[PDB]
Design a protein around this ligand. Structure first.
Ligand SMILES: Cc1cc([C@@H](C)Nc2ccccc2C(=O)O)c2oc(N3CCC(C)(C)CC3)c(C)c(=O)c2c1
Ligand SMILES: Cc1nc(NC(=O)N2CCC[C@H]2C(N)=O)sc1-c1csc(C(C)(C)C)n1
Lengths: 239, 1020
């Protein structure tokens, strides 16, 4: 117990460097800070609470009746709805160990690059899939129209076709039948283009999930490579 | 599903000049016909029915008039092409075929729905197919606001319609700051009213000297008097002349379409105030009221075709803790390189209400939990904004990781509480998101049903639960001294100022007093414990009877930190009563972005905004574009599209002008797609050759001439001055476009309209920046500080696609150095800027131009410091010939704080300190210290403090712009930058030392360093 012991005390580290020092942590993870003075950061209810320590006349407290005259007795008093504190954030967490902090960062950046060389080919794949999904929908409706066009033929025609047969004109009906046959041909041709596009659909649906699996394997690593490359304050132009 | 490319056929950007088109005739005959890519449907139909008489069953073909073309578009719908002026390539066909049918059904409905669908970028039929009851209830009900707005439009049949189309462009207050009042002659201004006398335009002037605060009718009266002076009339006869013909005319701005329709002071009109400040003379035009109302459409509103005992206990009756079952998950893309678990949690906006509970670690390959999770929270203690954020995570214990997330509103839009079985398709995780849940993430099931689909079963009670009506909450609600020094100090601290638990309970305790100082309501609400029906019920009753606060402060209650419905209802009511149309336009970006946060489709905020958009076309236009520019994002697509459907089904005849704008932008997108993709590696000479070739084609000329500039629909875009149009050097392949101004007297304002169309970069940054610059210039001018900024227009119209106003006769300092020439000197010499300004401003013009330069430079410097904008060298700062400075390329927020690693900003070298110090006070080798530099400094200091005084506003602006997934605007930690530049923690007089120190440092660091011209590296 002193002014700075290095057990649960940091300087005026910002609020950006507190939430992440106790993010998704249990009811307890706490630390002492400074105010615009002292500050106490605490965790409970799945939330981050903030309590000020009034220091006037070299004495410290929370409520109106002051019950301390030092900084570190305050913590141990309540430590053992003012729920107790549990787990503190230590200061010493892992000769001139500075050069080694390239090998552990060189992973991250490269593993970021390889993830970027994947998320790109995820987005590009992803949208490419939706495209094909719509094109099949287009083909389907296109086919319907031609199938409706056939209905228009085998209805308007079957009054002329079954009028020239009772009049003797085969190679006039041969023109009509040549037309109807090309119409049906342009139906089967569309159906086959659509079947091929469904083949590419399932090709890309497998490639998509392979990309997703590789991303799911890579992701746990990058977060752990984030905490390994933390910097030391006060030093300039380390590469 | 909207189409993916702006091509003319599926997977082809441009149709070859001649295309084979399979025509399906109405007698069942298929005829392949060669058409020109630009050919209209009229001629295609004519040459079809001509060459179709060669094919059998030719006698059945009726007159070609009685048939219409139908086809399949790239959106995969059957478009019946009723407009047969449309060209083949503009059809947006899936494949080149055309079916010929006879018209069926109601033609009007088909046409209107097709126009709405084109405007949105999504066929309207897709909404009809949606089965969610909330969607259809919104679609049906929102028409109430639509009808109310159109009724207010036809309330005053002739005049109100004109007010809707051409609303008065005025400032908020008529009070004219004194340094502006002095600029005019003893309280009055010189004005010039013009009259067009015959068709092949002759023009006559009437130079009036009028009180600056006169209404338009009074100006018309003075013009009539001017004319009825040469007239021979009695004194009472002149009196009767004016009396009868005062309000038979109306005033318009010469050169654009802004009209003075309302009884306002002339100086309150933005154009005239601008004329005063800039010293330019206002040129207006007289116009007969009949000659305007004639050109109004009389657009009506007709309803669409979709306008077509159960046991219930209240939530205040249930005694149990919230519990939910986690059944199973359809599939997970796991490599088996490791066990997964479902982490859940109940949240009230950003923060969770209770403690987050998890499922058990299960096989990665086989995903089943089937476990009834209990939540540490009381069911009646649930606020109205309670909702469930959950996610599927993995393990190696050693290294956790999220995979697929999902959020659900725990109540219905009907107020019912969820119970029984439910299936939720999950969403993916953003690129750089490592959080175990997604709280701010959008609520609802995934429309894409192919991604991971979780299944679960909520607790089913005896009957159907509902959240209690407000009266029950009031019934529940019905159960000193002097610490005010603090309340008038914590209510003045910025929103991001820490809220200690001492202060939280100190506020909640003395809450019934807070009403006296109403602006403290934001802070107060943050100090409430929302998982307590007790405190929630009390706070509800405090909210209802709360004093209306200023609108700028009420906006805060609409950002993410305040999700409770009563809070947002209060803010919305505040806006409905106290917000001016002017500032509603001013802050529209944030207001649109904030719609995302609201729980349900139908709410008070959307109704308010839609009503004001259907009441004011200057709002409605940008309302439309801001919503449409986000239809690319699926997370917002449905909400924003339904809202766009609502607007387009009511705005009336402006819809067609919007369609023209859309059409033109589509063609531009497609052209730039070609320049960027297919012709990527072609030389610029050949790309410009192609550009000329393709623009001259008639589909383009017709589609991109004669329409309203989305940047400011008060400007008409006339004919393209093609000889000026060009592709810009920028790698992203922009398009410099030049239009004539078609205005009857384009001579008196815009000669040329020049716009940059860039397909590549995200503009939301630039937009927000320029909006803030605009706000700052407003603040400085209201406080009598004449710092002339240039917040040039900028509008994002789609995913990294937008428009940029050009400033006429401006040049980069890079240019001015080079453009000014070598003049015999390979080096610009840095002095040159001063001599180029001196070469374009001689005599007495010199001093006033120098004043313009310094006044603009100071403001832009201060703004570049307060906002995190770096990268300021001779290629981002521009000068006009009159000498106004202004900055461009506002690409990065908060000093690249997200970017890189975060160990810089200890030193920043400004390159051009000397180059400006020469202009700001001429000559004198020691211009480190001159009187003029002292005045420059005082200006900068006053400006810095002026922004610091209003800081809360800008904090709120940035906090509202967190809905947009902007690069350097993701967490509040980002926004916290301006807290440091302004030094809101340090006292007012300590912050001036902060500013002066930073500025001195940068100036001297600039004196030393070397620029290395092109690459702008250093040498020290
Ligand atoms: C004449 C001049 C002087 C300065 C600075 C260097 N000097 C002062 C400024 C105000 C008051 C006093 C001094 C003083 O030193 O006495 C300028 O700074 C900027 N920046 C903005 C602030 C940054 C840190 C980003 C550097 C770029 C720009 C853009 C200028 O146009 C500018 C112009
Ligand atoms: C405001 C603005 N004004 C411009 N005007 C000009 O460029 N000119 C005027 C006539 C001569 C010509 C010139 N100086 O070459 S470009 C621009 C502007 C705004 S954002 C931008 C990026 C393309 C750099 C992003 N650019």
């Amino acid at each position: 117990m002193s002014l700075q012991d290095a057990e649960w005390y940091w300087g005026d580290i910002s609020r950006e460097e507190v939430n992440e020092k106790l993010r998704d942590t249990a009811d307890g993870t706490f630390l002492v800070r400074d105010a615009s003075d002292y500050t106490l950061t605490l965790r409970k209810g799945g939330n981050n609470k903030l309590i000020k320590i009034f220091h006037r006349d070299g004495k410290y407290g929370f409520s109106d009746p002051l019950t301390f005259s030092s900084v570190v007795e305050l913590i141990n008093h309540y430590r053992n709805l003012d729920v107790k504190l549990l787990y503190p954030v230590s200061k010493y967490q892992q000769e001139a160990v500075g050069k080694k902090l390239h090998e552990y960062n060189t992973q991250f950046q490269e593993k970021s690059r390889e993830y970027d060389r994947l998320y790109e080919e995820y987005t590009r794949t992803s949208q490419e899939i939706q495209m094909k999904r719509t094109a099949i929908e287009a083909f389907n409706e296109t086919i319907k129209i031609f199938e409706e066009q056939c209905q228009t033929q085998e209805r308007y025609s079957k009054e002329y076709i079954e009028k020239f047969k009772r009049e003797g004109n085969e190679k006039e009906i041969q023109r009509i039948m040549h037309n109807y046959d090309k119409l049906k041909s342009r139906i089967s041709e569309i159906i086959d283009s659509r079947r091929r596009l469904e083949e590419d659909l399932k090709k890309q649906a497998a490639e998509y999930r392979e990309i997703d699996k590789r991303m799911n394997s890579i992701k746990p690593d990058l977060i752990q490579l984030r905490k390994t490359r933390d910097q030391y304050l006060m030093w300039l132009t380390q590469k | 599903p909207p189409r993916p490319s702006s091509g003319e056929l599926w997977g082809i950007h441009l149709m070859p000049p001649r295309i084979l088109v399979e025509c399906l005739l109405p007698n069942g005959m298929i005829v392949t016909l060669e058409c020109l890519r630009e050919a209209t449907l009229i001629t295609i139909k004519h040459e079809l029915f001509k060459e179709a008489r060669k094919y059998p069953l030719h006698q059945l073909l009726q007159d070609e008039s009685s048939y219409i073309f139908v086809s399949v578009t790239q959106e995969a719908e059957r478009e019946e092409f009723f407009d047969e002026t449309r060209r083949l390539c503009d059809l947006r066909l899936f494949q080149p075929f055309l079916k010929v049918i006879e018209p069926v059904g109601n033609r009007e409905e088909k046409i209107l729905n097709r126009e709405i669908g084109f405007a949105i970028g999504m066929p309207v039929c897709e909404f009809d197919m949606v089965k969610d009851p909330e969607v259809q209830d919104f679609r049906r009900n929102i028409l109430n606001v639509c009808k109310e707005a159109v009724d207010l439009r036809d309330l005053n049949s002739p005049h109100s319609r004109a007010m809707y189309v051409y609303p008065p462009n005025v400032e908020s207050s008529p009070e004219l700051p004194k340094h502006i009042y002095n600029k005019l002659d003893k309280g009055q201004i010189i004005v010039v009213i013009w009259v067009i006398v015959s068709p092949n335009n002759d023009k006559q002037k009437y130079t009036l000297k009028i009180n600056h605060d006169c209404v338009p009718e009074q100006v018309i009266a003075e013009a009539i008097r001017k004319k009825t002076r040469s007239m021979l009339l009695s004194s009472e006869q002149l009196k009767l002349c004016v009396l009868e013909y005062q309000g038979k005319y109306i005033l318009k701005v010469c050169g654009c379409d802004e009209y003075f329709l309302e009884k306002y002071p002339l100086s309150q009109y933005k154009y005239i105030r601008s004329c005063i400040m800039l010293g330019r003379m206002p040129n207006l035009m007289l116009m007969a009221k009949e000659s305007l109302y004639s050109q109004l459409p009389m657009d009506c509103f007709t309803m669409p075709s979709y306008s077509r005992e159960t046991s219930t206990k209240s939530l205040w009756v249930i005694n149990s803790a919230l519990r939910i079952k986690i059944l199973c998950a359809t599939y997970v893309n796991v490599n088996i390189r490791d066990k997964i678990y479902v982490r859940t949690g109940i949240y009230h906006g950003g923060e969770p209400l209770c403690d987050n509970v998890n499922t058990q670690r299960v096989p990665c390959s086989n995903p089943r939990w089937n476990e009834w999770l209990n939540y540490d929270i009381y069911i009646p203690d649930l606020p109205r904004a309670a909702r469930l954020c959950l996610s599927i995570c993995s393990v190696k214990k050693e290294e956790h990781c999220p995979l697929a997330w999902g959020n659900i509103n725990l109540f219905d839009y009907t107020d019912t509480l969820v119970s029984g079985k439910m299936a939720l398709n999950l969403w993916p995780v953003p690129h750089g998101l490592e959080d175990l849940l997604n709280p701010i993430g959008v609520t609802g099931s995934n429309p894409n049903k192919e991604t991971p689909c979780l299944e679960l079963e909520f607790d089913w009670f005896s009957s159907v639960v509902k959240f209690p009506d407000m009266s029950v909450i009031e019934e529940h609600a019905n159960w000193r001294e002097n610490d005010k020094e603090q309340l008038k100090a914590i209510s003045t601290r910025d929103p991001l100022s820490e809220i200690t638990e001492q202060e939280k309970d100190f506020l909640w305790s003395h809450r019934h007093y807070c009403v006296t100082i109403p602006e403290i309501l934001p802070k107060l609400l943050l100090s409430v414990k929302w998982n307590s029906r007790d405190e929630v019920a009390q706070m509800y009753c405090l909210v209802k009877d709360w004093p209306p606060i200023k609108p700028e402060q009420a906006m805060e209650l609409l950002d993410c930190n305040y999700p409770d419905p009563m809070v947002r209802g209060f803010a919305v009511r505040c806006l409905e009563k106290y917000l001016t149309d002017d500032k509603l336009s001013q802050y529209l970006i944030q207001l649109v972005q904030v719609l995302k946060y609201e729980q349900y489709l139908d709410n008070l905020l959307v109704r308010f905004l839609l009503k004001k958009a259907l009441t004011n076309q200057r709002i409605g236009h940008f309302f439309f574009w801001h919503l449409k520019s986000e239809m690319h994002n699926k997370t917002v697509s449905q909400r924003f599209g339904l809202l766009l459907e609502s607007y387009c089904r009511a705005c009336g005849m402006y819809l067609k002008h919007l369609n023209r704008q859309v059409e033109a932008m589509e063609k531009l997108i497609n052209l730039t797609d070609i320049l960027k993709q297919e012709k990527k590696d072609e030389t610029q000479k050949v790309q410009m050759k192609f550009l000329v070739e393709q623009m001259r084609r008639p589909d383009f000329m017709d589609a991109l001439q004669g329409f309203l500039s989305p940047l400011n629909p008060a400007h008409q875009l006339g004919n393209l001055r093609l000889e000026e149009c060009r592709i810009m050097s920028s790698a992203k392949r922009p398009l410099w476009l030049n239009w004539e101004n078609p205005d009857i007297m384009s001579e008196l304002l815009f000669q040329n309209n020049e716009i940059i169309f860039k397909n590549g970069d995200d503009l939301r940054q630039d937009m927000l920046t320029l909006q803030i610059i605009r706000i700052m210039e407003n603040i400085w001018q209201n406080q009598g500080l004449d710092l002339r900024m240039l917040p040039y227009g900028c509008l994002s119209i789609g995913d990294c696609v937008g428009l940029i106003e050009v400033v006429r006769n401006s040049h980069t300092i890079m240019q001015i150095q080079c453009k000014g020439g070598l003049k015999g000197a390979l080096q610009f010499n840095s002095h040159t800027l001063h001599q180029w300004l001196k070469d374009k401003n001689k005599g007495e013009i010199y001093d006033a131009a120098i004043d313009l330069f310094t006044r603009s430079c100071a403001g832009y410097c201060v703004a570049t410091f307060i906002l995190g904008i770096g990268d300021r060298h001779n290629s981002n700062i521009m000068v006009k010939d009159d000498g106004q400075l202004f900055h461009i390329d506002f690409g990065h927020f908060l000093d690249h704080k997200k970017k890189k690693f975060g160990y810089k900003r200890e030193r920043v070298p400004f390159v051009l300190t000397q180059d400006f110090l020469i202009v700001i006070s001429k000559g004198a080798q020691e211009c480190t210290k001159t009187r003029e530099f002292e005045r420059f400094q005082e200006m900068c200091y006053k400006a810095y403090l002026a922004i610091r005084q209003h800081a809360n506003l800008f904090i709120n602006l940035f906090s509202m712009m967190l809905g947009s997934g902007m690069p350097e605007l993701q967490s509040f930690d980002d926004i916290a930058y301006i807290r440091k530049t302004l030094a809101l923690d340090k006292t007012e007089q300590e912050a001036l030392e902060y500013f002066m120190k930073q500025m001195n440092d940068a100036r001297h660091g600039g004196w030393t360093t070397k620029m290395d011209w092109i690459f702008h590296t250093i040498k020290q």
